Ligand binder design. Structure first.
Ligand SMILES: [Ca+2]
Ligand SMILES: [Ca+2]
Ligand SMILES: [Ca+2]
Ligand SMILES: [Ca+2]
Ligand SMILES: [Ca+2]
Ligand SMILES: [Ca+2]
Ligand SMILES: [Ca+2]
Ligand SMILES: [Ca+2]
Ligand SMILES: [Ca+2]
Ligand SMILES: [Ca+2]
Lengths: 603, 603
């Protein structure tokens, strides 16, 4: 908004940007009438009372300075004319604010452009994320960036006495970079403002914007870019600002992908195990990449999305065991982004591994819908000197991507400590579209007791007989405490995901307590499975054999077959189980991103 | 929520905390009926279909373990009884959540206790904020803290096999401390969890909680304290959690105090100037403290408030000139809190001085009400190599106190750079309850021109004559650019405070451009005034003398008299004006805090 003050002493000269509101102070220097050239529209809510509001609007840009005029006449005495020469310009900075009112808003009916972190590597043969320099080295790189467009409509000579400057706050320049195209940098970590070399008349200049940081504890994730129109007419004074406009970009969050999303690519380490996963992949329709152990624990493949582009992004875990380089060389690349968090030289724990990191399927909870589901990750029930957690920097980061609003589950009771070890999700053809698989000691005691009741108490696990497993009073106590622990999470998941019992399938699974009374799988942990659509790669439990078949496998089939799930039991025993993890821990999946556009959520 | 599983194999034993929801899984091990002792109420929404929900509620705490029982009978065959022995306890952690549903919410109808930073010094003769140690050294200190209360109702022997532990996340322990009273620490930066020594029966233990950090960029300002009930019955297993409850405190923000709040105490430095402010104070009803120059620029007196207590808190500016120690020795003390921000060894600017920091009066803006008004502070219109700003750490801090939602105004055009130099607010007996005073070159040219018209063009400012001031073409150009700058802010303030023109009074004030074309006051800056209720201490302009009186003083009186304001013109010329500041820059005020409770705002 602007208030021009006019005077009989002499004429006023002023610019009006189309779309702003220009009022007029007629009273300050001195009844009155107003007449203006045809291009000016004087609405006028005359007596010389200062409560009278007089606005001026223009419809077309001027073709020449002082193009349009307003004449205010003051009247017992003869008239006194105060003159005002106006020049109208179009000054509009444009973005994709309708995601295909200078505030960013969530929702299908909100407004605000979207910006991707340029955290992938389109560059020829380098090893750096594209955004860690001040150059656009490849044409393909521009697809990842967001287009912003300055449009001006001015007289041929306007920029004789005006300059436009594009700028970002100092607090946000470390998070964004802006290239101008005919590509060179105009804004970035080094430069917060830049004078545009614009010609008079009708012009358009394209800018390409990338982000350099994902939202975090210290970054809500909004970047503001402003254009300012400056009067540089009087050579003995500074620039005076005449008009300021600006777009607000929101930095796209890193988004995770539940087991219910159609798989696209599988990952593992390098013999018979390797072959069975390679059969599942080929059935699941996805391509396969291999590495020459715990491919689950070191990385998590998410994605970032915007109306113009969407690409997968690896979340490299701060645990830095043998697979440490795999995310930065093999996965990162063209349309494959990269993020990491946490201390990299050491200072982590086992809950920092990404088998401790999962997402739920889309869910609705006492009204609040979570279209991308909710990150699940494990920790203790309270902090003590013995208790473990995922590092605060990872928790903080997942929360700052506000979209899959994380839930803390209880995993510290397990030796290894991964939510993976007691839970999985699977597709289902009805009811919310999935099932929760929770590991269940109750279920396996039931199954074994029924087996001994039907006469098979001499049947051998692995070698232990059913009769002995059930009579073992310590095994039972251990598995009761483990039931308490899993049950605590059952109810967490129930509350935080809005699940009912009919959303949940118990899978027979027995546990044992070992070092520091932490829990480990008594036989191969079936819930630690690889979900490749409806083709499931479950660990071979090597269960009691009744009627020419493992009664364990049989029970799971009874449970998952009627959901249209096809169970394959992979042998991972000497290769994986005895080393504290299973099929799910020896693998990873790239899955299809949600169709639902994260920015349409109202978190 | 809890789901107890009952079995014919043998009786189940379980605790139920009053106020939780206990359901029953009758189907897992195996028509049926339920009968329970009188203390249990079985609502029951029978056939043995697993879709049948069976909850149990208790009304009184048990007097002894397994006090209450539920008997589930299974029935062609004769009955099979599964038994369940329940023990009910009261476990309730209490706070002042109704500020005189385990989420903190803003508003007159929301919920959540409030926590003060213990940033004052009640301690005898020390020099440290109370909260920088793990001791409560004085009884008086407990008034600043918030009371939390654990109530238990259990059988005399319950804590034979259960322990309660109080805890805070590791991410929040550095921001809170908790003392237990009969006072010693149980939680804090060192300790995230603690085992409570509670006796069976009916007990209550008081805790006293203080906060150690104000909300900031890295602290939204919520602290969560949780109690956990742990079963420690089986000596060969870890503790199993049975019940978790928790209160959420919000850390009270630092709140600033507009010129419209009744003054309580004035501050200055040590001759005739000093005496005139001492007359104004004594009329304004407030006490006076003095220091043996720019008392405005180094500190800002705000306050923190909670239902139990409210105290003033100094905001010591990172500029560290001669007055650097004044906030930490003279102001800080009993019921006088302390905060600071920004780099303290150097790395600041003049916009960092707190004459660059003001608040508006309470205001409403296109619907959104701001009951505590809005922080105003100055910066440039865009960032260049020459432009100045208030340090990001100060801006970040003021914004994180979400309450007086800051507005950036344009002050970098002034030499010194303070919003103080072009604006003040004053009480008014009508219309929103105040006036905005903006400095106005327009007004003074008008006044002088009218004076020369009425024959006084030989009248002497200071020595310059009116005739010459008006004929001076450079003075005029300078004052036009300065008008552009003040006008830019007029409209900012109009938009961001919802002001209309009738909220604003122009005060005649002429400026000159000097070093680097920055602006300074041509004569004593009248808008830089000390507002002590309705008693105003304005700088003596030493204006042209007409009719035995400065026509400048006269104009201001014409302007402020009819608002019931009493102008006193203090001479600060050789003492203050010639050193780049005025009365407002040579002073400070403690003012009465808003009656409106900040937590009732919906920011
Ligand atoms: Ca680049
Ligand atoms: Ca790229
Ligand atoms: Ca890594
Ligand atoms: Ca790309
Ligand atoms: Ca994972
Ligand atoms: Ca203390
Ligand atoms: Ca205290
Ligand atoms: Ca200081
Ligand atoms: Ca106190
Ligand atoms: Ca101030």
């Amino acid at each position: 908004g602007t208030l021009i003050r006019v005077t009989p002493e002499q004429p006023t000269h002023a610019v009006c940007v189309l779309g702003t509101l220009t009022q007029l102070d007629i009273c300050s220097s001195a009844s009155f009438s107003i007449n203006a050239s045809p291009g000016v529209v004087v609405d006028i809510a005359w007596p010389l009372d200062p409560g009278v509001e007089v606005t001026l609007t223009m419809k077309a840009a001027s073709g020449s300075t002082g193009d349009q005029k307003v004449q205010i006449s003051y009247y017992k005495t003869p008239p006194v004319k105060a003159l005002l020469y106006l020049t109208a310009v179009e000054i509009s900075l444009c973005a994709d604010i309708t995601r295909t009112q200078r505030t960013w808003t969530w929702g299908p009916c909100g407004q605000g452009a979207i910006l991707l972190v340029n955290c992938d590597r389109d560059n020829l043969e380098s090893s750096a994320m594209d955004c860690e320099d001040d150059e656009v080295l490849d044409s393909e790189d521009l697809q990842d960036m967001s287009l912003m467009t300055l449009s001006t409509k001015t007289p041929k000579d306007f920029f004789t006495n005006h300059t436009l400057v594009l700028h970002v706050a100092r607090s946000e320049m470390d998070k964004v970079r802006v290239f101008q195209a005919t590509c060179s940098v105009v804004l970035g970590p080094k430069w917060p403002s830049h004078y545009l070399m614009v010609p008079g008349g009708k012009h358009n200049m394209d800018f390409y914007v990338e982000a350099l940081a994902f939202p975090d504890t210290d970054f809500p994730g909004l970047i503001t870019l402003t254009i300012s129109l400056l009067d540089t007419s009087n050579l003995e004074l500074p620039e005076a600002v005449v008009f300021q406009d600006s777009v607000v970009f929101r930095v796209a969050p890193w988004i995770m992908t539940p087991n219910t999303q159609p798989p696209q690519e599988v990952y593992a380490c390098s013999e018979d195990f390797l072959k069975s996963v390679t059969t599942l992949a080929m059935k699941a329709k996805c391509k396969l990449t291999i590495c020459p152990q715990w491919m689950q624990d070191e990385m998590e493949i998410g994605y970032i999305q915007a109306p113009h582009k969407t690409l997968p992004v690896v979340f490299d875990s701060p645990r830095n065991r043998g697979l440490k380089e795999f995310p930065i060389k093999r996965v990162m690349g063209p349309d494959f982004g990269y993020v990491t968090r946490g201390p990299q030289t050491g200072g982590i724990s086992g809950l920092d591994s990404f088998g401790n990191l999962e997402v739920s399927p889309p869910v609705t909870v006492r009204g609040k819908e979570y279209p991308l589901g909710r990150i699940l990750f494990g920790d203790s029930c309270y902090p003590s000197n013995d208790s473990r957690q995922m590092h605060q920097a990872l928790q903080d980061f997942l929360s700052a991507q506000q979209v899959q609003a994380p839930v803390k589950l209880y995993s510290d009771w397990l030796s290894v400590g991964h939510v993976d070890e007691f839970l999985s999700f699977v597709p289902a053809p009805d009811r919310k579209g999935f099932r929760l698989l929770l590991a269940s000691p109750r279920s396996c005691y039931k199954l074994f007791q029924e087996q001994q009741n039907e006469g098979h108490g001499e049947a051998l696990l692995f070698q232990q007989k059913i009769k002995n497993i059930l009579s073992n009073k310590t095994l039972r106590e251990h598995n009761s405490f483990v039931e308490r622990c899993i049950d605590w999470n059952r109810e967490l998941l129930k509350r935080e995901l809005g699940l009912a019992e009919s959303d949940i399938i118990d899978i027979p699974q027995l546990f044992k307590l070992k070092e520091f009374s932490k829990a480990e799988a008594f036989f191969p942990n079936m819930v630690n499975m690889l979900v490749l659509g409806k083709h499931l790669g479950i660990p071979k439990p090597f269960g009691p054999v009744i009627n020419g078949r493992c009664c364990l496998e049989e029970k799971v089939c009874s449970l998952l077959e009627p959901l249209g799930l096809q169970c394959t039991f992979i042998n991972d025993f000497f290769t994986y189980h005895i080393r504290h993890g299973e099929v799910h821990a020896g693998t990873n999946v790239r899955r299809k991103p949600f169709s639902f556009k994260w920015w349409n959520m109202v978190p």
